Amino acid sequence: GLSVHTDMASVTKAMAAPESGLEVRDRMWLKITIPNAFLGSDVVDWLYHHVEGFPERREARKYASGLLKAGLIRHTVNKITFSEQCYYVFGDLS
Amino acid sequence: SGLSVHTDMASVTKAMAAPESGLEVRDRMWLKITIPNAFLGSDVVDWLYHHVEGFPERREARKYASGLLKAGLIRHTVNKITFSEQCYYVFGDLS
Amino acid sequence: SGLSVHTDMASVTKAMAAPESGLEVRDRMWLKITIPNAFLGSDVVDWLYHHVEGFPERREARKYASGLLKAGLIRHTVNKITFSEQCYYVFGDL
Amino acid sequence: SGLSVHTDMASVTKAMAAPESGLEVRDRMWLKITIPNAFLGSDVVDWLYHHVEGFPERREARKYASGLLKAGLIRHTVNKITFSEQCYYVFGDLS
């Protein structure tokens, strides 16, 4: 039904139709170059392994959330709540 | 040994930020965007090779996909010109 | 810069494999499998809630779906017992 | 409309399983496997291009990555022969 002889716009319209078989998703992943960034779970891990006084990892997560509230670490996107799957940078440490 | 829950917060943070602290710190971040009906360039190429007659090899279906981008029939999700199988695309104006 | 196309390949790889090399390493991988007519647990829960009368709220549609898995009317694709909306399923022997 | 909590369960399932039932189906699924220290082919190519001098463009860094897979210095996690940026690898025997 379709070939290299078919006009391009018609081929694309067929590809864009319901049930065409094109594999699609409602999410995408993008890589941004940001100097000196770090993953929320990596902060929590570092705290739990290098800072004494956390009985369970849950308490390290809570400290990292405190760090964000104080502006010692900062969100890279417009977000308020602490999250382990988000990326962060250091605050003003002057 | 040396840092505890009793240490000043700024000083902990500055320990974590020093060179050689062990914190995984790198020049990148990954972000999840919700974009309904987006698609990888490799899946366009696969669809074309499987549904459009006359591609002697897969590389010819890749070149045709690049032609779709050039024409505006598909569009990059970010500001980039060259076609790549690893990037995400959406459909252009099909009205 | 200390590495180039003149460096032996084995040494370049041991550099990439070193701690703190820069290379993103994580303890996971995602595998894509072709399985005609598979579906997410959430897609089952949605269909029951929209098409079967008498559920007071969505949670009871979730419990019904878990009942379908117990009965073998739907099946996990991997060896697992607990029903989850995020997992993939196929139909049982009907 | 026709189906309720009083309907036998097998019949509800057969209705859900019929063509045009409205059930969202797919023919691809994604499985997560816990593999220690695995990495994407794309991150290999990014690392090489960023840290190894003498690549005129990124495609030469990819060709180099492919060199590494042939030599067994890196290894596919599933039985695939050719190098792909979208697949996951682990290191080979490094002593």
Residue numbers in the entry:
A (entry chain D): 416 to 509
B (entry chain C), D (entry chain A): 415 to 509
C (entry chain B): 415 to 508
Task: Give passages from the manuscript.
In addition to DIX, Dishevelled has a PDZ domain (Post-synaptic density protein-95, Disc large tumor suppressor, Zonula occludens-1) and a DEP domain (Dishevelled, Egl-10, and Pleckstrin), separated by long flexible linkers peppered with phosphorylation sites, and also a binding motif for the AP2 clathrin adaptor (Yu et al., 2010). Here, we use structural analysis, as well as biophysical and cell-based assays, to show that the DEP domain of Dishevelled undergoes a conformational switch, from monomeric to swapped dimer, to trigger DIX-dependent polymerization and signaling to β-catenin. This occurs in two steps: binding of monomeric DEP to Frizzled followed by DEP domain swapping triggered by its high local concentration upon Wnt-induced recruitment into clathrin-coated pits.
Purifying lipoyl-tagged DEP (Lip-DEP416–511) by size exclusion chromatography (SEC), we observed two main peaks, corresponding to monomers and dimers (discussed later), in addition to a higher mass species. Remarkably, each structure exhibits a swapped dimer, regardless of the crystal form: namely, molecule A (turquoise) donates H1 to the H2–H3 core of molecule B (light turquoise) by extending loop 1, and vice versa. Thus, two DEP cores are connected by an extended β sheet, composed of two antiparallel β strands (each made up by a β1β2 tandem) that interact with each other through backbone atoms of residues 442–447. Interestingly, the solvent-exposed “underside” of the connecting β sheet presents a hydrophobic patch, made up of a triad of hydrophobic amino acids (M443, L445, and I447) located at the DEP finger tip of the monomer. In each crystal, two DEP dimers associate with each other through this hydrophobic patch, thus linking four DEP cores into a cross-shaped tetramer. The hydrodynamic radius of the dimer determined during SEC-MALS confirmed that its shape in solution is larger than a typical globular fold of 44 kDa mass, consistent with the extended configuration of the swapped dimer seen in the crystal. The dimerization defect resulting from mutating E499 and D460 can be rationalized by a striking salt-bridge network between their negatively charged side chains and the guanidinium group of a key arginine (R472). Notably, E499 is located on the loop between β3 and β4, and its salt bridge with R472 appears to be mainly responsible for tucking this loop under the DEP core.
